[PDB]
Design a protein around this ligand. Structure first.
Ligand SMILES: *[C@@H]1O[C@H](CO[C@@H]2O[C@@H](C)[C@@H](O)[C@@H](O)[C@@H]2O)[C@@H](O[C@@H]2O[C@H](CO)[C@@H](O)[C@H](O)[C@H]2NC(C)=O)[C@H](O)[C@H]1NC(C)=O
Ligand SMILES: *[C@@H]1O[C@H](CO[C@@H]2O[C@@H](C)[C@@H](O)[C@@H](O)[C@@H]2O)[C@@H](O[C@@H]2O[C@H](CO)[C@@H](O)[C@H](O)[C@H]2NC(C)=O)[C@H](O)[C@H]1NC(C)=O
Ligand SMILES: COc1cc2c(cc1OC)C(=O)[C@H](CC1(F)CCN(Cc3ccccc3F)CC1)C2
Ligand SMILES: COc1cc2c(cc1OC)C(=O)[C@H](CC1(F)CCN(Cc3ccccc3F)CC1)C2
Lengths: 528, 526
């Protein structure tokens, strides 16, 4: 037997598994329980810590995925299936994963913690694109990732109630971060140098840990990829959380908060999932039913407020976006879009698609969106309208939320590095018109191109290794630069770098013109 | 007695004068009475036709300039003085001028009628840059220009009242155009080929005659240079008109509309003028106290509505703007601006300037302006801010009004040609940073560079003869072309031409992205 694959944590003993990468072996401990299964009367409640166990927990395989909707948009299409659960669904899903070099480091190694995205309704640590083995080998960090509850199980909120307080998925994350503090050294990780990194709802989560004091003590650096806590989709007010929870009850046959939540616990998990999307208040895309709630507890105020008021001296942050943030979301409900044609929409479809991409704004607000995003020299050109609506959805939801976060963090004392990821993966199966879509940088960050049994080019394997160097550099020193230079982003110079097969190129302004509209002007309009 | 300088019209007989040009001679009839002097009891009242006369009126010099404010911003400076009155100020001022070829034409000749600008508060047909002798000599047309009352005397309204109905200055113009219909034939002109053209408030006036059916029978074609009736300064609502009249009265000692007007009527013309600028409701630029009023009579609705509703089939229109419409106005009130330095304003001065250039809008509207006109990669670059405030004032008051007009006119039946004047005169005396300012294409249209005693280049003289040809061709045929082409402006293609020393170049969209803001979004916000 191998003693590098045997580890004792506070709760008990663990057997890991040796994993093979093209560059060497890696120790993996998959499926370590870190909470009491949130089942039956624990559904919707905050997570209890895992009671200790006797015997040796088997940690050689990924564990269950938390209950979530499964995407049926293009059944069997790799572009959608690569995100769908690849383990059984269960409510007994609160496990985490640790990947470490082989043999286990004998001296403290920096730790990266991966929080996955999925709009807070989906996701799992077991997806192929989140495979830790290549980063761990190439860059000799410790990598942790965890499963957190999603959909109604993680974020259904009857605010003020004791039976469904909201944000328990976030608390799941916090407990994994606490677990890392007490146990990561048993694997060679240094609990005093922990970097969070996430994408989409995972970047939004990272950001919510920045703005929540009880979590801020649990990590030291943050990477936010294509997401931010101040996005219009990442949080919901108390009022609307209660409406959405209440309508979910009605849709599954349920009727006083106590009595309501009681009835919900008796339903099969799948039953709640089936009605998830029907509690959205209008036809939308990039909007999700059960998301974090601003209730004064986990967030004492809105993330936009806590950002504008924070002191971020001592913080290093790496933030960035893909080149075509919006394009992917359009094939989920914008009129005239499909992955199977050119989606050369008409002006009437563009106008229709604008109310779908920007839901619950006034007609005056939507008008202003159409003003800024029409080329009035070419007001009905189909290719121009397709790209324009893509820019609407991507700017409103990702790029300008991110650009505001960066600018306020920088002008308040944090050191910020900003990127735009401009490489379309040669293996990408979505049509060419989607450009570089939401999510398709993750594979390069995790170094999946180095997997020989996949079809990436030689120049892409090198790109991948550059990216894993930047990230791991940032994790070790709060600076991606290997000591052309990657400058910090400031509110004035607004400098960022392009990431692609070409060397680093420095630019200015994350869509600075468009983001004045969404960040400066549009709030003032909604206030009158 | 040269009989080419002797003409009889329905009022009586006229003696003209024979003027020299580089190219030959021209008959001129300057100072023809077309109205009874609007004096004493006739102040503020609609114009009354000139009662017929015995003897020969001797129409051999320009008559007086109607009472108006005199610009004193840079005293002595050629740039401001060239627009100030060159004849005496008098309420007896309703005279018009006819230029015609020497000898007078035998075959009926197309007529150009000129309506001067000056923001509805100033101006005169007798200014040097409106000298008709060169157009007439070079292009064989009849040219008419008239004086019309300005300031309070032309546009003070107490709407509804019989003693001060407003729009009387426009009725002065209308009366001149009736005069042109009954009488231009005697000068060999053709009353069935009349082309109105004007600039700034003159163009706004031309547009109001398009939209007013009684004027519409008096002409056939139109040219609007750097102005339009839908501009935010060219009209005022009945209520704001009455307020401004009533404050003018209180300011000069006057207290019932009949009693109020009668008291105003006893004040020296100069006393009214001296209080004109004080009745404006905000600190502003490009806003003028007494302007046409929308009262259901002359204008049955706002020009915006009348445009949007009008059937313009059968009309040909030539419209355009200079390259930097707004710059010239900033030295009259925007903080940090001067003709005498380089005017590199700060961000704080820029924001302050926006409230001056866009007055009477909400803070929200003002913020929307600051958004569209800031470069957010260079938010505090003084040179970018100067050019941006220039574009704010120019787009809001001229370019976008003109563009909406052109668009709707083409969409709704009219043939339209559009231009951007892009040549900075060599003799221009305003600073470089203002570019090609408001008003400085006019001298090239009237052929002033052909005057030997001025210092224009040989290029500028060729360019002026080009422009006079375009304008004259348009007046004759409704098409500035003659057998590179100048294409019609259309609502979809938005095609226009650049006028400068280089040959015609076709461009696309009159500041289309900007004007979407002012013409589509901004109203909906208000
Ligand atoms: C691009 O496709 C969309 C989506 O249509 C679906 O996918 C196509 C590949 C084809 O299989 C269609 O039959 C599918 O319905 C087209 O928009 C649809 O147009 C149909 C009419 O044929 C209409 O009934 C649907 O409502 C439309 N769907 C949406 C989401 O608006 C679109 O016309 C195609 N674009 C082209 C051909 O340029
Ligand atoms: C450009 O000039 C303006 C106007 O100032 C006037 O003209 C100058 C040529 C000089 O003669 C000044 O003394 C005149 O008052 C400047 O703005 C003025 O600044 C003064 C302070 O010196 C201030 O009292 C006035 O309020 C300002 N006037 C306005 C209309 O804002 C401006 O500073 C000059 N720009 C430069 C030098 O870059
Ligand atoms: C079931 O009715 C709906 C389903 C969805 C929407 C709207 C619906 O009705 C309004 C979306 O907007 C969702 C689309 C994504 F939001 C878009 C891209 N992802 C891929 C992805 C997953 C994880 C991490 C990164 C990533 F890029 C899939 C879902 C689904
Ligand atoms: C006395 O207080 C003011 C005086 C003026 C303004 C504002 C004031 O206080 C707010 C303007 O904005 C006016 C300036 C023009 F706006 C610019 C110069 N022109 C000359 C001109 C005349 C005819 C045709 C074209 C042309 F360019 C006229 C006035 C003056």
């Amino acid at each position: 037997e191998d003693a590098e694959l045997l580890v004792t944590v506070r709760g008990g003993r663990l057997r890991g598994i040796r994993l093979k990468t093209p560059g060497g072996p890696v120790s993996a401990f998959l499926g370590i329980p870190f909470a009491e299964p949130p089942m039956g009367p624990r559904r919707f409640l905050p997570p209890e810590p895992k009671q200790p166990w006797s015997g040796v927990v088997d940690a050689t395989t990924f564990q269950s995925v938390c209950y979530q909707y499964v995407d049926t948009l293009y059944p069997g299409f790799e572009g959608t299936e690569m995100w769908n659960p690849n383990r059984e669904l269960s409510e007994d899903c609160l496990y985490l994963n640790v990947w470490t070099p082989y043999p286990r480091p004998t001296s403290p190694t920096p730790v990266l913690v991966w929080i996955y995205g999925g709009g807070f309704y989906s996701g799992a640590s077991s997806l192929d694109v989140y495979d830790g083995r290549f980063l761990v080998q190439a860059e000799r960090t410790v990598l942790v990732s965890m499963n957190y509850r999603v959909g109604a199980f993680g974020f259904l909120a009857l605010p003020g109630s004791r039976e469904a307080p909201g944000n328990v998925g976030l608390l799941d994350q916090r407990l994994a971060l606490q677990w890392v503090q007490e146990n990561v050294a048993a694997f060679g990780g240094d609990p005093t140098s922990v970097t969070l990194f996430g994408e989409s709802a995972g970047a939004a989560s990272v950001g919510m840990h920045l703005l929540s004091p009880p979590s801020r003590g649990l990590f030291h650096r943050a990477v936010l990829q294509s997401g931010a806590p101040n996005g219009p989709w990442a949080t919901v007010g108390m009022g609307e959380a209660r409406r959405r929870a209440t309508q979910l009850a009605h849709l599954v046959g349920c009727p006083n908060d106590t009595e309501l939540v009681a009835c919900l616990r008796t339903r099969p998990a799948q039953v709640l999932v089936n009605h998830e999307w029907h509690v959205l208040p209008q036809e939308s895309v990039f909007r999700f039913s059960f998301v974090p709630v601003v209730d004064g507890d986990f967030l004492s105020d809105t993330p936009e407020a806590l950002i504008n008021a924070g002191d971020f001296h001592g913080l290093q942050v790496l933030v960035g976006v893909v080149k075509d943030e919006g394009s992917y979301f359009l094939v989920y409900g914008a009129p005239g879009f499909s992955k199977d044609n050119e989606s050369l929409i008409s002006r009437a479809e563009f106008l229709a698609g604008v109310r779908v991409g920007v839901p619950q704004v006034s007609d005056l607000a939507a008008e202003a969106v159409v003003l800024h995003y029409t080329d009035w020299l070419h007001p009905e050109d189909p290719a121009r309208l397709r790209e324009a609506l893509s820019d609407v959805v991507g700017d409103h939801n990702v790029v300008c939320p991110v650009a505001q976060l960066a600018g306020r963090l920088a002008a308040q004392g944090a050191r910020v590095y900003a990127y735009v990821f401009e490489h379309r993966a040669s293996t990408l199966s979505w049509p060419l018109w989607m450009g570089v879509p939401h999510g398709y940088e993750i594979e390069f960050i995790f170094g999946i191109p180095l997997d020989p049994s996949r079809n990436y080019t030689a120049e892409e394997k090198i790109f991948a290794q550059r990216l894993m160097r930047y990230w791991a550099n940032f994790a070790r020193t709060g600076d991606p630069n290997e000591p052309p230079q990657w400058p910090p982003y400031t509110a004035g110079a607004q400098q960022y770098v392009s990431l692609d097969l070409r060397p680093l190129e420095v630019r200015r302004g994350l869509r600075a013109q468009a983001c004045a509209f969404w960040n400066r002007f549009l709030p003032k309009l909604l206030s009158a």
